[model samples]
Target: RVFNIYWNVPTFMCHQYDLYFDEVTNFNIKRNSKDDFQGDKIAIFYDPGEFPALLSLKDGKYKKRNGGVPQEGNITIHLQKFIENLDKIYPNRNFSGIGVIDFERWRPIFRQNWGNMKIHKNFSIDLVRNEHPTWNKKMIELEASKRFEKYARFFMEETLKLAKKTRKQADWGYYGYPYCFNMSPNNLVPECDVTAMHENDKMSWLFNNQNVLLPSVYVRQELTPDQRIGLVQGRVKEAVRISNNLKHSPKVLSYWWYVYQDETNTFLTETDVKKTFQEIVINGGDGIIIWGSSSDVNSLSKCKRLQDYLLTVLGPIAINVTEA
Candidate 1:
């Protein structure tokens, strides 16, 4: 039952934009029981910003504070229930925490917990500040190391504790969107069983170091057709490069079938998704997570062309299909 797949369904909220939490949980239970569903793990959405009520302190309630995760709750109980329920539902599948922490989003808390951060190196806060125009590479590294360790400790401690309650071994990695704040080079994420890189072409640096390296290919609607393909190629090559040099390389999980639609038109075409999937598999990757937002789930279900292609390979193992 140890299949190599990572999939997600948007669960940041149970409002109109997303399915109700109970609905999501039930869908997963039924989906996991399906013979055609090959996913081995479910990527749960646990971003602090998305769920203020859960991530906030004791007696803390959800509030729209500048549109960020209200850092005011006792996260232990909420997080424990989350993983415990998942274990109760899909007892066989492993779990991974996604959107655990964003450096920019969790900066205030990092500052508050700086003393608790496991920084093996010495550094100065003043020197790393942007106001200090005389800072050098060493200064940046020191700062990055400090911040990265602080978040890693926070994410790991919470995730590991809850996972233990469920008596399961968690994949235990969050979205480390590399360029977001020079967060990658600090080498902090290798501590987890899985290392996930969302949008970094140089993600290969994280491979070979973790138990599994998940390189995701999220479609950039801003990019033109040619630009998108080139970016996908770079990602596939990097993932392949790591797999070739690693002792235990996990499948390069991708956002292959993700399609976005706004007011006017849909973003990625069926051909684009096919080519991206073909590229990942043709190169060296083995799995994909059909990432879909609440707004796009209906259309995702109706994607006959993409579904047909998927069935030929692994069937439509939709990640976050928000409907019944």
Candidate 2:
């Protein structure tokens, strides 16, 4: 059965370091089960078409292929079997959350947007509320919410079943972009047990009202030390503020950016990393996860200062040494 380890800081490890063979690049830690299973939690972040193949359909094959369309009924069964396979590999691993159901990242056809916008031929805000073409802003939002809610329920219910079977204690949740608070129709308000939001600016829509808040802070090379600190402080405060008024025990996350380069290949300095973590601990965040980093394990090993900085913040026991 899945054990709950969310708030337990020592249980966390780098995301997806288990499936080394599946990776295209030279990413992943080369270690046995003893060393690799350093942490108790595992995050299942993936591209739109990635999860199905990882679920293990022999050669990872599927008959139908559409990033936006839902899969067959047996999809959940495959996911459950995948977890059972994981259980055989790691006999007594505890799980935190499956994570990040934010459909906006990989699939856009189903995503909620501002009114009258078109993502594709078949799906759009206009299409959903075509009957109420002259509806006011409130009416338009209501229609969007209904449409999104139906999809979220269909998606989460199936995933939650998987979570219950494999990681019984795992919370069901997804990652969200900063604008999710107001713009995305699939906010999933009270439905999620864990809420993770992504943002690197002073303004963030993710609040701490949910079980967990794992916010993303993209560390760009141009950002000043003070600016970085301010951004982290704001994110943590928002998590704290929202959780304070809620009834459940909430976790405010502090994430790390190991992939130093952006889309344009602009790399951030070690100073930027230090400043970001320093602010997280100072504010109120106790958990940190490695989000974006080199797939090349050798390159990661070469970065001695980055490793040292991680050791300084997380200490020896908290940090999982991912060797090449």
Candidate 3:
């Protein structure tokens, strides 16, 4: 069944402080968010230095000189503070999990921490001493081989294991690699699965390790409805296909943005949002998380626009579809 991943925080700014409290309260109240964790109630946590706080220096496991996700590490006091503060934000609602989005967002950042990693120490890296890693915009080179994936998987594995006490599941993801390989500005139908096989000869550790495979499904405005639908379907196929039953069938919750993930201010029209959401659902996405960002003033309107669509159109069908 298709389920709606409803949430209160409209934009990234909402996480900072009390400025967006009233709006958040309204969104939660209207959606019956405080009722229960029927998949709709989940918190996406982000805070300044949240990642650093979560990463520990206590055990030989986290020894930066030698790296791999140490089977052991200490949770710092800062994380406790973050949890307490997070509790304050939505005291009434029961969140299914915390979608930890910050620390593991980039693959190269972890690659740069080669010295701090262990499992894939045998896995060779491209950079030499003091060479700056090219983490700027392009990613094809970084994703060309399984070497990066093997090394990167450990960091995800350990942090989540450490974070187990906090929520039902600390589902942190962006797939160090983009789910859609051939995606681009004008091309909506770029190659979604550069490699169709989600499995290799060996047991795949990366897929087995993480809680959810959250491939970003953010679509652009420049594309026609046909283009958007094709893009969404392709991306969903990429994730859902890989999400096949395994040691643990990880859920596929594709990330989305009503506003294109670009400088363009033109957000998706309500219809556009509905179309993409349905496309993801129809194509086998377990659920979706809609997020946005802009100047504080602009974020207010963008937040409400999406919240409205959720209330009326998406919510009705969101509750399920044989395919949703």
Candidate 4:
């Protein structure tokens, strides 16, 4: 379920502070009115530097310390104070909430500190650096193959804390954006091929508990026959893996595909589409989130015949059919 919305601030017009706020708020309110966002939830994301501008209005202080969330409002501040601060100083503001220090959102910047975020008992930045060598994104990606556990825990703990606490209030444990950790088990299964760490080390810790996964479309253009077989096999493997390890079977699995009309406008026949999807379901995959374009939405009216075939006849046939 989508519980939050992200709105970004305009980057230019350095002179217009108040004007920017009014415009952003107005635009979002209008935009949301047209869309079907069921929840009253909303989150505006910009740079961390821009956050004080928003909180400056509240009658509370904000700060982050001790690896925990920032302190709640303790000082007397108001939105009006923010307006005043702008009028006087008009300084460039930091983006608010988790975006301020979000390593994921600003990965290009944090790439420098890729493996450098480790915490230690000795815990001096210099000492940690001496103990283990740090690497760039490419090298870190290589390390991840064998060291998935170290990164998974690191991502789950720090990321959740930062995202949850930084937001004035959020749906806890869900930051509302896609990340590597949240991908579905079948899709983002870690490469446990690494034996550098023990079987029960951090990598195992992450794989054991991590449950989220994304749609295959996000990972590839289209599934090849072999890829589809792999996905089906992976789903079976994941269900067994999760049930065995966690003692509970998965209740839901989803596949999302966005259908768009490109210049070529090549098409798949309705029969072929149905056969492909039926193969998926027969092979163990279930749930389909078909993203539609404006044309698709309009064309949906013509699918009543196919819908009738399913709801009227095919629905009961499935109970009698068996796999060959």
lDDT of 3 by residue, 69-176 (tens): 221212354345445655665442334553444444234223333333322322233321113364432343344234444434544454554444455534544332
For lDDT, candidate 3 versus 4, the one ahead is 3
Top lDDT model: 3
How close to the true structure is residue 121 of candidate 2, measured as C-alpha lDDT? 19
> In order, what lDDT does every prediction score?
0.40, 0.40, 0.48, 0.29
lDDT for 84 (candidate 4): 43
lDDT by residue (1-324, candidate 2, tens digit) is 111112211111333333222121122221222224322343533332113211223473423223222322245544555456545544444565434333332222234332322222133244445767788866775565555444434544455455445556654344532222321135322111223232222222223212455555554444455655555566555555555544563565545554443432333455555566566556666455554333423343333433443345323223222220
Best-to-worst ranking by TM-score: 3, 2, 1, 4
Q: Estimate, for each residue in 149-219, the C-alpha lDDT of model 1 and write its tens digit.
A: 45434444454445444434444323422222211235322121122223233343333333344455665
| Model 3, residue 49: C-alpha shift (Å) | 6.1
| TM-score for predicted model 1 compared with the true structure | 0.48
- Summing lDDT over every window of 10 consecutive residues in candidate 3, give the lowest-scoring window: 65-74
TM per model? 0.48, 0.53, 0.59, 0.33
lDDT of 2: 0.40
Task: Pick the winner on TM-score between candidates 2 and 4.
Answer: 2
Tell me model 1's lDDT, rounded to 2 decimals: 0.40
Q: Identify the runs in model 2 with alpha carbons over 4 angstroms from their true place.
A: 1-39, 47-122, 129-145, 170-173, 176-211, 259-268, 294-324
Task: Give the poorly placed runs of model 4, Cα more than 4 Å off.
Answer: 1-152, 158-240, 258-272, 291-324
Give the Å shift of residue 249 in candidate 4.
2.5
**What's the best-to-worst order under lDDT?**
3, 1, 2, 4
